[PDB]
Design a protein around this nucleic acid. Structure first.
Length: 51
RNA sequence: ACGAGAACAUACGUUCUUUGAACCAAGCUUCAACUCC
């Protein structure tokens, strides 16, 4: 009879769903030597280079 | 030197009036953005 339940999925390990977006060696990826990575948007990158 | 001669079966008149090709019906069902090294 439509037994609705609230599922709280506790991520005990690394959870990855992907979704079809591959990031190449230097293609939108910005990896620096302080053990964090930043990533960029294609539109503002391309117009920031074309300006 | 014909039961004959002469004589439009003719004139007038809307296949027309009223009438939803409608009513009902999920583009949906089942799918891990993934496996290997």
């Amino acid at each position: 009879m439509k037994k609705t339940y609230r599922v709280t999925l506790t991520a005990l390990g690394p959870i990855f769903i992907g979704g079809g977006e591959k990031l190449k060696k230097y293609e939108y990826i910005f990896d620096k030597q302080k053990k964090v990575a930043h990533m960029i948007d294609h539109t503002k990158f391309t117009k920031y280079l074309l300006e």
